[PDB]
Amino acid sequence: VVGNAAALDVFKFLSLQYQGKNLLNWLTEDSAEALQALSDNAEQAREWRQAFIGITTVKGAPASHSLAKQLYFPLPGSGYHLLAPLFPTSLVHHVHALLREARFGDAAK
RNA sequence: CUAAGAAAUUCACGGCGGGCUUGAUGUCCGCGUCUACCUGGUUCACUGCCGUGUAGGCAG
């Protein structure tokens, strides 16, 4: 979850719903798991279901930056495409958790 | 047209003190090397000889 650095504390309260229950997908859609133990009115339930959709959906406009890479690639019989690569946060999290049980851990030690 | 394109790491210092490596010893033993012959290399391409000048009798 990339975003405002001094605003990533409410993300823990929004994402604790995938801990304990199975109601992480109950806050935005399927608010029957957010009406009985939420204890808010229709304005509060609607405002929560509207504000919780702005995480997984788009946050801003699709763009790039001058400090990005944006390589060129020659085409087979044409000009070029600009290739702007990105950092695989999901893949590096998966390989990082994969290697922390392979270098140390219970069985590997 | 390259994870393209850009960049000052700076500075300082006590490692220090001590000390028994000891003792012993059999290297023994044997043997056929064998035959063969022409330097006056020019031990300076000439020493030393009547004129230091280009012709000459000598130890040849």
Side-chain angles (χ1 to χ4, degrees), chain A residues 60-75:
Chain A
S64 178
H65 194 268
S66 177
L67 272 300
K69 299 300 179 184
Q70 305 171 359
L71 286 75
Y72 284 96
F73 202 93
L75 287 179

Side-chain angles (χ1 to χ4, degrees), chain A residues 3 5-7 20 32 34 37 42 45 51 54 60-100:
Chain A
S64 178
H65 194 268
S66 177
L67 272 300
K69 299 300 179 184
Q70 305 171 359
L71 286 75
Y72 284 96
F73 202 93
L75 287 179
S78 180
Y80 298 95
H81 295 296
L82 280 174
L83 303 178
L86 297 169
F87 185 77
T89 302
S90 301
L91 184 68
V92 72
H93 179 76
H94 182 74
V95 70
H96 202 268
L98 191 275
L99 200 147
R100 74 171 70 256

